[PDB]
Design a protein around this ligand. Sequence first.
Ligand SMILES: *C(=O)C[C@@H](C(=O)O)c1ccccc1
Ligand SMILES: [Zn+2]
Lengths: 257, 8
Amino acid sequence: DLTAFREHFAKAKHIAIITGAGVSAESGVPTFRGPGGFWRKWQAQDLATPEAFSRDPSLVWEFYHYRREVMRSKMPNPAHLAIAECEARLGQQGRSVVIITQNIDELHHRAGSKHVYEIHGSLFKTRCMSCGEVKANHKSPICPALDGKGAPDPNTKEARIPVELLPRCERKSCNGLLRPHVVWFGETLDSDILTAVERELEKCDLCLVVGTSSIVYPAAMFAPQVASRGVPVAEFNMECKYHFEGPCGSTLPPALE
Amino acid sequence: GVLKEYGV
Ligand SMILES: *C(=O)C[C@@H](C(=O)O)c1ccccc1
Ligand SMILES: [Zn+2]
């Protein structure tokens, strides 16, 4: 019931919106998981691991370079936009909106959202393997050796880039190998981010779960905490307290206007 | 620390 949801929306002073893979899938963002979602001969399970990076950093960087570069042609969708406009509009009224996203593509930021927690990191951040520095990086290509590399076609040869020519840390003294600042399979979420998320979720008086569900990770980490405060939760997804079935780019903008 | 996907 959209009207009942909107009655809560009109009164809520602090909205937390959790976004999952569904909202990035509607922008056409490949993630390489499952049904013939291949990059050359591999899937994300093979590459998005510290062991793959340790064994073949050039191959893993080709894969991340490809992913960075495809984002030039993948755009924010109406769900991203509605969420950013809603944040701006409510902020002007002294009402707060925060986004907790599992997505690493920065589409929320390209849509105009400010208060965003990236629990899995970003394709457009690097972390230095040596000094640990995390930095924004949108450079195309990230390093000259990767220029024109990363093609997904199974026939493509490996670039076999020497490790010293992959992205390096720019502090002259350091020059460590950079890795994508993304949470890989088998790795832990950042505790500081989770603390901040918990504070937002404790404060919130309405919670939306978009392009994933309350019962799965990562929403399942916190959604019980919010439900037990008596706080309404509204789901927007394509799956079987409120639930709006369909593509988020159709359902969300009318709910948030 | 929390493993992504709970390690699953
Ligand atoms: C974990 O989810 C895998 C990781 C990746 O593919 O590098 C990822 C993180 C967040 C969203 C999609 C993929
Ligand atoms: Zn460094």
